[PDB]
Amino acid sequence: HGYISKPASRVYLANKGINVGVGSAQYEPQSVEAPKGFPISGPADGSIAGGGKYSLLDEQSASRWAKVDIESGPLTVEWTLTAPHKTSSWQYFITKKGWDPNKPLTRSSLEPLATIEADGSVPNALAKQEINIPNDRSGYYLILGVWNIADTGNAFYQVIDANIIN
Template identity: 55%
Template sequence: MIQNVHVQAPRRLSLKPLWIFLGSLLLFFLVMVITANTASAHGYIESPASRAYKCKLGENKNCGRIIYEPQSLEGKGNFPTGGPADGQITGAGIFTELYEQTPTRWSKVNMNGGPNTFKWVLTAPHATSDWKYYITKKGWDSNKPLARADLELFCSFNDGGKRPPNTVTHTCNVPNDRSGYYLILAVWEIADTGTPSITSST
């Protein structure tokens, strides 16, 4: 799931505000949920609000049909080896409007560097392999659709096949060595289906 967020570094570091773009593609904006083609696992990041969830709330415009189903941002799984093609990650290879990327296209969320809590709402929980959180690298080009080479993993949780509750929260240390506009992608990898898929939220 991807989200647009404004992340600020701790004051003691005297860094400029950090914008994290999660495109409901995760949590904020770029949050990806990995589920299966045969048994969809639906979910999105509610807080900080993902790109898709902000579409449902009306804070993002011209989003297409995702406004009715932010929990359905799903595609092929096993990210980053598998999953949507580069340039289609934020729309999970399905929701084309969410592929768009410019510095001003999506509503952003303010965040601070350091510990941040991500809250998932799962409408169809499934046995889970793991959860992964990525952030765009320093120097990424915010005028181009998201690609794997733009991302680095900064937080992960292994669920070992357990079935999660309908609400899941994770606390992750968002890198505090960035300032400006960045994107966060969250990935939910499903364990109980043969062909996992990805659901993005910011």
């Protein structure tokens, strides 16, 4: 169990009262748990942000969500792990240049951003990965972070509403 605390995820911002209207998700930012193996297995298209668990997180419009300022260049993503587990990988995706901010999030919406493979070890409770925020684009993009658990069929899904600045 865990969530992305910096840059703050959509559900973490709901937990801190910055996003509103997500119902039960607001109390369990650490529990957006669904099958691993994305972008094959995992949450269904249109239900990725809520992990197939929290449907109010799946709403998508230009104005719906608070956006976190992220400058282009190197970024260290921080996960707060309320229950660290043996880990097989950390995956990051970003919406494609030209994506439609008023449509549901699907596999076809995304492209790969970064993957940090892991050796099965249990990470630190503040788990950090280095990624590169591109400078080929500006403004509102979704970044999907996925924490894949080595010893179960599951993963934790953390969409971030990013404002890429350059």
